[PDB]
Amino acid sequence: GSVVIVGRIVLSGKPA
Amino acid sequence: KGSVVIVGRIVLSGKPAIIPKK
Amino acid sequence: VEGEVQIVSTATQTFLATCINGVCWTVYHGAGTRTIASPKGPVIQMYTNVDQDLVGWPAPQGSRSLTPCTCGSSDLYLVTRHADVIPVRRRGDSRGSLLSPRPISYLKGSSGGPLLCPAGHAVGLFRAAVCTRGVAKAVDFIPVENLETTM
Amino acid sequence: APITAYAQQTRGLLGCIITSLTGRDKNQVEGEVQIVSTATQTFLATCINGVCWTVYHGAGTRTIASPKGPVIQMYTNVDQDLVGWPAPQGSRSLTPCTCGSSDLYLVTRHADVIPVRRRGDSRGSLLSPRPISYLKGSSGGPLLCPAGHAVGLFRAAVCTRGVAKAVDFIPVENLETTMRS
Numbered sequence: 001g002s003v004v005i006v007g008r009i010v011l012s013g014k015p016a
Numbered sequence: 017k018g019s020v021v022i023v024g025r026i027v028l029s030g031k032p033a034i035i036p037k038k
Numbered sequence: 039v040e041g042e043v044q045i046v047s048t049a050t051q052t053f054l055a056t057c058i059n060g061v062c063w064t065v066y067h068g069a070g071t072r073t074i075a076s077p078k079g080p081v082i083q084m085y086t087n088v089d090q091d092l093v094g095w096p097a098p099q100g101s102r103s104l105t106p107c108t109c110g111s112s113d114l115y116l117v118t119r120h121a122d123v124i125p126v127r128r129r130g131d132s133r134g135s136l137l138s139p140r141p142i143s144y145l146k147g148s149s150g151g152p153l154l155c156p157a158g159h160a161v162g163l164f165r166a167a168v169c170t171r172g173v174a175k176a177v178d179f180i181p182v183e184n185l186e187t188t189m
Numbered sequence: 190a191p192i193t194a195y196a197q198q199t200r201g202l203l204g205c206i207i208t209s210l211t212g213r214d215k216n217q218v219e220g221e222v223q224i225v226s227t228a229t230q231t232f233l234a235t236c237i238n239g240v241c242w243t244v245y246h247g248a249g250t251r252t253i254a255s256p257k258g259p260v261i262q263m264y265t266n267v268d269q270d271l272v273g274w275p276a277p278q279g280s281r282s283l284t285p286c287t288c289g290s291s292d293l294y295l296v297t298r299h300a301d302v303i304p305v306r307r308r309g310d311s312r313g314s315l316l317s318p319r320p321i322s323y324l325k326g327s328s329g330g331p332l333l334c335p336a337g338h339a340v341g342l343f344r345a346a347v348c349t350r351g352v353a354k355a356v357d358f359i360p361v362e363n364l365e366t367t368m369r370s
């Protein structure tokens with residue numbers, strides 16, 4: 001099986 | 017002379033956020 | 039936008055990964071020797087280290103790498119899988135006490151997440167919670183120095 | 190929570206030039222630090238207590254393009270290298286540093302916060318040196334304390350063979366001083 005990236009987190013809060 | 021122009025910004029008030037899919 | 043922390047999951051569990059210095063690091067106790075998925079197919083780990091509970095593949099798409107701490111502050115902040123920031127006082131190289139104990143479920147799925155210093159720089163990787171009666175009062179982690187040597 | 194920052198560019202060369210001449214900028218403003226450019230250089234301007242400050246050697250005595258045309262400087266101190274305009278409508282302002290603090294953090298034009306150790310009232314050593322190029326364009330930027338309060342504004346680089354080891358800054362005190370002048 002594989003590890004799947006289900007989301008991301010931008011620590012600066014950048015919405016751009 | 018001319019005027020100083022704002023060409024961008026740097027935001028510090030932002031806090032960790034989970035990037036939206038859309 | 040690009041994220042430094044990926045929220046990953048295997049068929050059995052969901053945890054976190056933190057891209058630091060080009061590599062997407064996470065905890066061995068969640069991934070093992072599993073490969074990270076990608077559009078081109080699965081990609082193999084660049085590093086694995088059961089002794090350190092550390093493993094890492096090359097940084098995914100839409101990610102950005104964290105910078106290691108260079109100030110050596112002991113006033114850390116933990117980022118959970120929900121993007122909450124938890125201040126943590128550094129008690130030791132791999133140990134830190136929460137500045138406010140939280141229920142055990144508040145730190146779940148956060149293994150692999152980053153432990154940041156006042157400058158938002160990586161100080162370590164959240165290894166596991168040291169709870170008491172179900173309350174996480176302290177945290178265990180893989181200091182970045184280890185990732186720096188492993189890489 | 191730790192100090193984190195992100196950058197956004199709001200206009201390019203051609204728009205910048207027009208806006209400089211006309212002095213009429215109608216773009217929305219957000220943030221504490223504004224990336225600023227003249228026809229000769231780009232630097233930064235930090236908003237502290239409702240006032241947008243920057244390094245005199247960058248702003249000179251020019252006006253700031255705003256949605257109502259040019260805006261003359263509120264403060265001008267050639268000797269302390271300071272100039273101030275009313276913080277642009279939309280910006281958020283930092284507040285000066287209470288409790289001094291020895292552990293400083295320089296926010297760069299690229300939105301990077303790099304550790305700096307205070308070695309005096311106006312100088313701090315870079316914990317991890319960087320090439321001068323890295324620091325280019327971030328004059329007027331803020332030097333924060335672990336709490337996120339302005340301690341000073343980046344003014345100079347202590348260069349050694351193309352690598353900055355230390356940085357000279359203008360202490361917030363000089364702002365308060367310049368204001369009563």
Ligand SMILES: *[C@@](=O)([C]([C][C]1[C][C][C]1)[N]C(=O)[C]1[C]2[C]([C]N1C(=O)[C]([N]C(=O)OC([C])([C])[C])[C]1[C][C][C][C][C]1)OC2([C])[C])C([N])=O
Nearest residue numbers: 230231232246247321324325326327328344345346347348
């Ligand atoms: C800032 O205005 C720049 C940012 C610098 C460029 C590398 C970081 N700051 C300056 O231009 C200041 C200005 C100039 C000269 N400056 C320097 O930082 C120079 N260093 C310097 O003068 O050092 C001492 C003597 C310690 C004060 C530096 C420039 C780059 C090459 C190496 C030398 O005059 C002052 C000091 C007022 C911007 N535009 O982003």
Ligand SMILES: [Zn+2]
Nearest residue numbers: 107108109155
């Ligand atoms: Zn640090």
Ligand SMILES: [Zn+2]
Nearest residue numbers: 286287290334
């Ligand atoms: Zn302070």
